[PDB]
Structures are given as structure tokens and as C-alpha cells.
Amino acid sequence: AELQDMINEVDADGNGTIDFPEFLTMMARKMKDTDSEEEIREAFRVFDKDGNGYISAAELRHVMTNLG
Ligand SMILES: [Ca+2]
Ligand SMILES: [Ca+2]
């Protein structure tokens, strides 16, 4: 399945990837956990496949449940 549709549902502003503000906002959207930019930034490099400082849908699967 193309995770592109998930990319489109996670995309808030149209950069096609989650940014620090977006990740935090989509997170806190209903569930609010940790908000320390260090930890959140650590997540960005962990979640992403390329660790390019952003969390995309495909990247989500890499880190989350699937192989990326
Ligand atoms: Ca964005
Ligand atoms: Ca990436």
C-alpha cells in the first residue's frame, strides 16, 4: 500500500512531512505527552529513515512497526 495517502493526512501545511511544530501539534492534538525540543528532536532523527530531521509517514513505519 502507498503510505502517500497517510503522508497526505499527516501533512498539515503542505510540506509533505511533519515538522517540529507539526509533530507536536498533531501529537498534542488529542494526546499530550512530553514537550522537550531535545527529546522531540531526538525522535525526529529516530523516526525518520534518513534521520533528515523530519518525520514523514513512510518514516513512521520505518521506526514504528514496519521496516523503513
Ligand atoms: Ca508542514
Ligand atoms: Ca526521512
Side-chain angles (χ1 to χ4, degrees):
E2 295 73 78
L3 303 177
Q4 190 173 30
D5 77 281
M6 178 64 61
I7 297 179
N8 274 267
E9 190 176 275
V10 176
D11 180 53
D13 53 26
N15 64 332
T17 183
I18 245 176
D19 202 315
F20 289 88
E22 297 174 273
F23 188 78
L24 272 183
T25 305
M26 275 55 267
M27 192 180 190
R29 191 69 175 199
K30 63 170 301 178
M31 54 178 296
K32 181 47 183 45
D33 190 82
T34 304
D35 64 290
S36 178
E37 194 177 280
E38 310 172 279
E39 292 293 275
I40 308 300
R41 189 180 301 203
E42 291 297 285
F44 273 74
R45 68 171 182 109
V46 165
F47 279 63
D48 192 271
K49 296 179 180 175
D50 344 78
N52 60 269
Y54 287 112
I55 302 175
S56 188
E59 320 299 84
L60 277 169
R61 276 202 168 178
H62 159 90
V63 66
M64 212 189 178
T65 322
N66 201 85
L67 191 61

